[PDB]
Amino acid sequence: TGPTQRHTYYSECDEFRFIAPRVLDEDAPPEKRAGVHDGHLKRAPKVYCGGDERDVLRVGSGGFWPRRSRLWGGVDVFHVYDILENVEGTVITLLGLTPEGHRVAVHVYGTRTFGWYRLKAFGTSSDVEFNCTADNLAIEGGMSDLPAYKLMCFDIECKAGGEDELAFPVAGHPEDLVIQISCLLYDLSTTALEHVLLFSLGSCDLPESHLNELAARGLPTPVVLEFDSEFEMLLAFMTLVKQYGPEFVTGYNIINFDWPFLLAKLTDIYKVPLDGYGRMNGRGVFRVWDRSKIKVNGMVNIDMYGIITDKIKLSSYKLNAVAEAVLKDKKKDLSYRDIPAYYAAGPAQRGVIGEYCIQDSLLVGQLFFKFLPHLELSAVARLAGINITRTIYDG
Ligand SMILES: [Ca+2]
Ligand SMILES: [Ca+2]
């Protein structure tokens, strides 16, 4: 039988373009440690974690990252945060959470924005889905606290791989690789940090001092996901994005750098269709366009750089200067000038790259929870009668 509408995200993958820095071949002689390998490889993408080893696209009990996924590849009151329009007649899809924290999509038929509602083959990555008409819906008065939506705060590190290692990385150059992704998952209602993930191209041993500091701050112990190539890492990040499905996503300059870089790699280098990687399982919007906008269906992208430049007056809006100014937190900064020499040194030094990548995402979380931009944007979305996505990206 299978799904009525085809899922277009990778639920399976048995061959891919393998691109990796040759310096990770710590067993190879120096004459062959320069540049990147770039070829095809006929095996399933895989991820390593703490000595254990899994296929990236396998779903089961032993997963290295959290999921909020009912369906994978077809295998098996509410609060609305976002609304999709699609054709089946025009169907209006309300995306949301119940008080229990189940993900819902309610498909409203017969038509020709943020708050609680009452009711009176899935098209999406939800736990339950409903067909109804607009008369089956009413605003649930007396409910105003946000359900347990999830925020993903993320940051990429890139490494230019051409004859100048200090050159600004260009996504269209196959040898300019994403080498790490920090991915911090928070509960948006309680503000609790629930997971600290570091995606790493190559082996990566975070330092004891960093692990002890996070433990002393009472924060979750980081999970390091190690990968042999850029595609396996990018596929796994997108797999987490689809499987965990953070309703809100934040970062610093993620709209003008991180998202455009990732999506350029995924689209141009690897030929991965992005239209099933949002909330919808295929034929959904997932696009960056030019400073940039972004639309990912079912995901609210909030760039803290935009929020902060709009809100504080500063001599510099570099994340470090902002952290010193706003949080009073004097972050020590790893230079982009350091990254190539550290990356080539071994898993301990790639661990130092990892620490600073995690610390960056942690500051952006603190900034996020200070300004609470989602509260400002949802308030405007309610008042102005438009969805929160359009509230951000339209004038
Ligand atoms: Ca960033
Ligand atoms: Ca960074």
UniProtKB/Swiss-Prot annotation:
Compartment(s) of residence: Host nucleus
Consequence recorded when altering residue 44 to T: In strain: Nonneuroinvasive mutant HF10
Superkingdom of source: Viruses
Endpoints of the signal sequence: none
Record text on subunit structure and interactions: Forms a complex with the ssDNA-binding protein UL29, the DNA polymerase processivity factor, and the alkaline exonuclease. Interacts with the putative helicase-primase complex subunit UL8; this interaction may coordinate leading and lagging strand DNA synthesis at the replication fork.
Assigned protein family: Belongs to the DNA polymerase type-B family.
Function description: Replicates viral genomic DNA. The replication complex is composed of six viral proteins: the DNA polymerase, processivity factor, primase, primase-associated factor, helicase, and ssDNA-binding protein. Additionally, the polymerase contains an intrinsic ribonuclease H (RNase H) activity that specifically degrades RNA/DNA heteroduplexes or duplex DNA substrates in the 5' to 3' direction. Therefore, it can catalyze the excision of the RNA primers that initiate the synthesis of Okazaki fragments at a replication fork during viral DNA replication.
Protein name (database record): DNA polymerase catalytic subunit
Organism: Human herpesvirus 1 (strain 17)
Lineage: Viruses, Duplodnaviria, Heunggongvirae, Peploviricota, Herviviricetes
